[PDB]
Amino acid sequence: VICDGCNGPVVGTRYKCSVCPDYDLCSVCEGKGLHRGHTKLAFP
Ligand SMILES: [Zn+2]
Ligand SMILES: [Zn+2]
């Protein structure tokens, strides 16, 4: 899984947007508030 924020890996917790098709964030990008205006699921 590739982070749509930074093009890096999504290892550990994956943050998947519940609105967009196929939009995933890594924990660094999530913690920096990228794509914060949509509800996401965080799963281990
Ligand atoms: Zn990232
Ligand atoms: Zn989204």
Author numbering: 126 to 169
Manuscript excerpt for this entry:
Intriguingly, the autophagy adapter p62/SQSTM1/Sequestosome-1 was recently reported to recognize N-degrons, the N-end rule substrates of the well-characterized UPS, and where ultimately these substrates are delivered to ALS8,9. p62 is a key selective autophagy adapter that plays a role in the degradation of various cellular constituents such as misfolded proteins and their aggregates, malfunctioning organelles, and invading pathogens. Intriguingly, it was recently reported that the central ZZ-domain in p62 plays a critical role in the recognition of N-terminal arginylated BiP/GRP78 by the Arg-tRNA transferase ATE1. Here, we present the high resolution structures of the ZZ-domain of p62 in complex with 8 different N-degrons including type-1 and type-2, and subsequently identify key determinants involved in the unusual recognition.
